Amino acid sequence: VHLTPEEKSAVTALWGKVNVDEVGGEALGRLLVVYPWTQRFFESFGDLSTPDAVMGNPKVKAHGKKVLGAFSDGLAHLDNLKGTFATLSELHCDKLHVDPENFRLLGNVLVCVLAHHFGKEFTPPVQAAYQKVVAGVANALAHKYH
Amino acid sequence: VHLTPEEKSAVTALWGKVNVDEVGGEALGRLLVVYPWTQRFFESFGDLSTPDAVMGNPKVKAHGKKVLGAFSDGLAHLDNLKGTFATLSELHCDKLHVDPENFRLLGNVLVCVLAHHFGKEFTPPVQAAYQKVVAGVANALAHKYH
Amino acid sequence: VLSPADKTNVKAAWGKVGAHAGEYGAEALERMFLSFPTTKTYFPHFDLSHGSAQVKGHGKKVADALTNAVAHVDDMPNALSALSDLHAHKLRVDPVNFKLLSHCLLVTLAAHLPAEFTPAVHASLDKFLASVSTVLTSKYR
Amino acid sequence: VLSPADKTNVKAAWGKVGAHAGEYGAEALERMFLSFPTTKTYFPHFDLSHGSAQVKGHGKKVADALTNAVAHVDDMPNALSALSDLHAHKLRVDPVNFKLLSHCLLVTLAAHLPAEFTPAVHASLDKFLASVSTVLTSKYR
Ligand code: HEM
Numbered sequence: 001v002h003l004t005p006e007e008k009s010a011v012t013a014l015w016g017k018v019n020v021d022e023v024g025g026e027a028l029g030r031l032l033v034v035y036p037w038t039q040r041f042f043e044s045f046g047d048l049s050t051p052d053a054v055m056g057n058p059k060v061k062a063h064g065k066k067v068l069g070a071f072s073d074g075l076a077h078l079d080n081l082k083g084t085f086a087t088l089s090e091l092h093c094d095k096l097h098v099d100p101e102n103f104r105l106l107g108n109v110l111v112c113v114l115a116h117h118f119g120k121e122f123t124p125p126v127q128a129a130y131q132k133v134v135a136g137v138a139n140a141l142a143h144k145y146h
Numbered sequence: 147v148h149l150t151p152e153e154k155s156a157v158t159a160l161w162g163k164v165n166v167d168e169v170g171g172e173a174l175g176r177l178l179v180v181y182p183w184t185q186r187f188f189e190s191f192g193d194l195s196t197p198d199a200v201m202g203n204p205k206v207k208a209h210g211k212k213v214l215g216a217f218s219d220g221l222a223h224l225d226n227l228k229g230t231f232a233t234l235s236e237l238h239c240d241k242l243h244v245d246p247e248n249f250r251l252l253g254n255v256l257v258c259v260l261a262h263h264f265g266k267e268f269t270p271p272v273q274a275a276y277q278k279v280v281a282g283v284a285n286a287l288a289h290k291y292h
Numbered sequence: 293v294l295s296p297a298d299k300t301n302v303k304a305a306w307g308k309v310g311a312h313a314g315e316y317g318a319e320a321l322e323r324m325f326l327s328f329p330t331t332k333t334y335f336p337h338f339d340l341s342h343g344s345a346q347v348k349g350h351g352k353k354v355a356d357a358l359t360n361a362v363a364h365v366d367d368m369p370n371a372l373s374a375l376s377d378l379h380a381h382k383l384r385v386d387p388v389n390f391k392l393l394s395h396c397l398l399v400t401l402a403a404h405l406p407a408e409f410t411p412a413v414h415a416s417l418d419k420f421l422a423s424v425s426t427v428l429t430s431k432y433r
Numbered sequence: 434v435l436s437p438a439d440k441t442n443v444k445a446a447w448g449k450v451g452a453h454a455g456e457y458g459a460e461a462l463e464r465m466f467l468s469f470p471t472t473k474t475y476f477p478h479f480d481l482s483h484g485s486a487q488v489k490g491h492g493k494k495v496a497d498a499l500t501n502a503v504a505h506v507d508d509m510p511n512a513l514s515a516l517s518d519l520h521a522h523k524l525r526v527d528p529v530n531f532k533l534l535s536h537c538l539l540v541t542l543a544a545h546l547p548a549e550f551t552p553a554v555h556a557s558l559d560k561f562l563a564s565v566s567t568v569l570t571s572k573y574r
């Protein structure tokens with residue numbers, strides 16, 4: 001994606017303060033609570049009956065850290081997101097059958113988590129930088145869908 | 147945009163049968179009728195209260211012709227839609243203040259008009275090729291927005 | 293909100309569809325799968341080939357539901373109650389897809405009803421499909 | 434449909450917003466203009482620079498309308514009737530933009546309510562904003 005040097009530094013700087021595992025579980029759990037239809041892929045994770053059950057679910061937490069870990073590695077390749085997520089795109093389309101809209105929803109939920117986590121540090125300009133990144137990753141993951 | 151040989155042939159062959167004057171007027175008119183809020187950009191066009199008033203309106207027919215005419219030139223540059231529409235893109239942003247979401251609606255309305263006009267000949271594969279073209283043009287026109 | 297003119301327009305257009313409803317349902321699905329590839333993610337268990345009896349069978353169910361909705365246009369929430377439960381709690385189709393199918397239904401109707409698909413009927417049908425879509429996603433959360 | 438739990442969650446969160454409603458509204462608008470540039474096409478008559486009186490004033494109007502919607506959550510179509518007419522007949526803002534402002538309002542609240550923005554409240558606020566958006570676009574056609 002096209003990020004100005006200042007936008008790239010804002011993203012990087014902020015990310016260095018992120019506990020990837022904590023935020024990954026938090027984002028995925030909120031995705032499942034706020035947009036419950038995304039729970040369709042996780043019926044094997046067990047109890048997702050209530051918000052506390054979703055947030056406290058160890059399998060939701062484990063999938064969150066895996067998803068956010070790949071996201072995190074993607075920030076080191078902001079200039080080649082399509083090439084970085086090509087295989088994951090194919091996997092999500094051909095084997096997992098994940099509607100790409102889910103990636104957009106996760107992206108917005110992630111932006112809300114960063115805002116809740118960082119408060120005033122998550123300024124309007126910093127949010128704008130993250131919106132571009134999250135849209136870029138969602139576009140990269142949907143690129144190989146056919 | 148990238149289209150397969152069959153898709154490019156489908157688009158080109160069908161377009162050779164399109165009377166830009168006639169189709170442009172239908173497409174713009176139906177846009178103003180089905181999605182009434184788009185009328186906000188045409189206060190100086192006259193009577194737009196009833197479907198019959200919009201469809202028979204001479205300024206709507208003239209503008210529709212201009213729009214599809216520019217759309218036609220883009221079909222001849224399918225491999226470089228962004229460069230082809232750069233000037234009109236800035237124009238639509240800086241001078242006209244047209245929310246790019248309107249380009250999407252027009253494209254869908256155009257597809258309905260081609261289907262209405264060509265019937266059986268506008269097959270599922272042909273529609274698929276046109277949906278790509280119309281999405282590409284809308285994207286090309288929104289490219290210079292800032 | 294569907295005005296009395298909208299209801300008349302919808303009843304008139306659907307009446308002309310009549311016995312061809314199922315065939316138009318299947319064509320609409322085919323148009324959607326080809327035009328919007330991501331919608332295929334909800335049917336990994338189907339053969340989506342052109343001519344597929346699975347698609348033809350599903351198109352007929354979709355079309356019958358719409359026929360039911362037209363007949364009960366003044367009472368859609370209850371008429372489609374089981375269907376909204378199904379999509380909200382089992383199928384869990386992301387809401388955006390209903391706009392994709394609605395568009396494809398419109399394109400299918402346009403290609404088959406040249407005389408009845410006037411600008412006014414087009415607007416009424418689009419309003420109708422948006423209402424059906426709204427009822428079908430009303431229990432999502 | 435906002436459940437009774439949703440209504441309780443919205444009132445509690447909005448109560449905490451309190452006197453800052455106006456400045457949070459202005460912040461949400463600034464976030465929208467930066468994150469989603471296309472929304473500026475609706476404000477070419479405004480000085481959109483940071484802290485302009487026009488943005489601060491509009492932010493206050495938006496927040497007051499939301500406070501009104503919270504106070505009459507059981508009857509929103511009636512409470513927002515005039516606003517629905519205005520957006521439908523004069524402003525004519527494309528429906529997608531309401532989702533963009535809703536997201537930016539949600540991010541603003543998240544950034545300012547660390548204790549109150551729990552997963553359940555986040556869901557309730559998102560549903561509420563979606564409801565307000567539906568009422569405001571209900572008379573579009
Ligand atoms: C930033 C977005 C995302 C990234 C970077 C991402 C990344 C990944 C990764 C790295 C895996 C592991 C694949 C493997 O083991 O080979 C995975 C698996 C999977 N993902 Fe995604 N993912 C994203 C979004 C989503 C969303 C939003 C959903 C659905 C709501 C989803 C559903 C799944 C499922 C069901 C699996 C299989 C898990 C398992 O078998 O244990 N993903 N994803």
Ligand code: HEM
Nearest residue numbers: 184187188212213214216217234242244248249252283284
């Ligand atoms: C997607 C295809 C589109 C193309 C290729 C396009 C093309 C054009 C062209 C060539 C002009 C004429 C400029 C001139 O002669 O100086 C123009 C003007 C205009 N367009 Fe677009 N346009 C498109 C869509 C839209 C849409 C969807 C809207 C809004 C609903 C819109 C609103 C306008 C307006 C307000 C003008 C000015 C008309 C006037 O001078 O009164 N355009 N466009």
Ligand code: HEM
Nearest residue numbers: 331334335350353354357358375383385389390393424425
């Ligand atoms: C106008 C909108 C729609 C109507 C009226 C409708 C109606 C129906 C009906 C009647 C069924 C069959 C239920 C039964 O077996 O009794 C069904 C199933 C289903 N629908 Fe929907 N639907 C609509 C839109 C969607 C959309 C947009 C998608 C996804 C892109 C979708 C995906 C499904 C799936 C996956 C099934 C199950 C098919 C099977 O396994 O047999 N539906 N729908």
Ligand code: HEM
Nearest residue numbers: 472475476491494495498499516524526530531534565566
């Ligand atoms: C939660 C959703 C929203 C609420 C509660 C809301 C509320 C309002 C209110 C209370 C006014 C002032 C009316 C008056 O002065 O009499 C207004 C004006 C306006 N709104 Fe909306 N609005 C919403 C969303 C939107 C969105 C998404 C946009 C566009 C991106 C928008 C664009 C406008 C414009 C251009 C004006 C005119 C401003 C002026 O010139 O003073 N609104 N809105």
Ligand SMILES: Cc1cc(C)cc(NC(=O)Cc2ccc(OC(C)(C)C(=O)O)cc2)c1
Nearest residue numbers: 108387429430432433529532533536563564
């Ligand atoms: C920034 C941005 C941009 C866009 C297009 C959408 C959003 N997010 C949303 O639309 C979230 C959202 C809200 C409601 C949704 O559907 C249901 C059926 C619950 C509804 O409309 O009430 C589906 C999704 C955010």
Ligand SMILES: Cc1cc(C)cc(NC(=O)Cc2ccc(OC(C)(C)C(=O)O)cc2)c1
Nearest residue numbers: 254388391392395422423528570571573574
């Ligand atoms: C192919 C395709 C893809 C997408 C995303 C949308 C569409 N089109 C639409 O959804 C049309 C549409 C319908 C209704 C709209 O808003 C109002 C307020 C009238 C409503 O929801 O009823 C706004 C737009 C078509």
